[PDB]
Design a protein around this ligand. Structure first.
Ligand SMILES: CC(C)(COP(=O)(O)OP(=O)(O)OC[C@H]1O[C@@H](n2cnc3c(N)ncnc32)[C@H](O)[C@@H]1OP(=O)(O)O)[C@@H](O)C(=O)NCCC(=O)NCCS
Length: 184
């Protein structure tokens, strides 16, 4: 079944149709040009939600919609995605996050990620979870290292789903294993 998880503040849940509106708004915001070359139109936003909902439908877990009881129905997503692409560290499971700027600076992505990794190791019994981003995305790989995920620069890779001359091609790899997760 589609796993519903609970943080102290956050509800990690399956996506609803109403979430597409809120996600599209996030992805149209000029502040996303810090992370992406250009803002997303509704068709692009909807294309990613389709991938998320496909993953949930096929696997029973995925990047959970973030509900904040007392505040907002949807502030972004955080959760697990199967790595199936042809890279050195695949097959494995990655953790990813996209938060509305209004909810930055509150440890909410931190809380969401801890809840997802608790699920990853205690429930799914995964040997490891990975994360990857571009070198300039300090906010994203900052959260990875604050979670206790660790990077080997030797494991830097070209993203095989991006063309050769794509500026974001070069990615850095973070890992956390069941063992290191228990140490917190
Ligand atoms: C990567 C991302 C999730 C990080 O979010 P964040 O809120 O900065 O990260 P955290 O949840 O770990 O919170 C850490 C911050 O909260 C603060 N904080 C306050 N209380 C805290 C607490 N109890 N625990 C942790 N941090 C806390 C920290 O001091 C830190 O502030 P800082 O960034 O100035 O150092 C966010 O920047 C993001 O989603 N970016 C991508 C957006 C995007 O791609 N959108 C496109 C949509 S299509």
């Amino acid at each position: 079944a589609i796993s519903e998880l609970h943080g102290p503040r956050l509800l990690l849940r399956a996506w609803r149709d109403s979430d597409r509106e809120a996600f599209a708004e996030m992805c149209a915001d000029p502040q996303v040009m810090e992370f992406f070359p250009s803002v997303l139109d509704r068709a692009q936003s909807d294309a990613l939600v389709d991938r998320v909902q496909a993953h949930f439908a096929e696997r029973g877990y995925g990047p959970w919609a973030l509900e904040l009881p007392g505040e907002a129905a949807f502030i972004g997503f955080t959760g697990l995605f199967d790595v199936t692409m042809d890279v050195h560290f695949a097959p494995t499971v990655e953790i990813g996050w996209r938060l509305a700027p209004a909810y930055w600076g509150r440890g909410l992505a931190r809380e969401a990620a801890e809840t997802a990794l608790d699920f990853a190791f205690e429930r799914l019994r995964l040997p490891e979870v990975v994360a990857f981003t571009t070198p300039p995305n300090r906010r994203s790989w900052g959260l990875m290292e604050r979670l206790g995920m660790r990077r080997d620069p030797a494991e830097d890779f070209d993203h095989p789903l991006l063309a050769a001359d794509h500026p974001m091609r070069r990615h850095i790899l973070y890992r956390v294993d069941a063992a290191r997760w228990a140490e917190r």
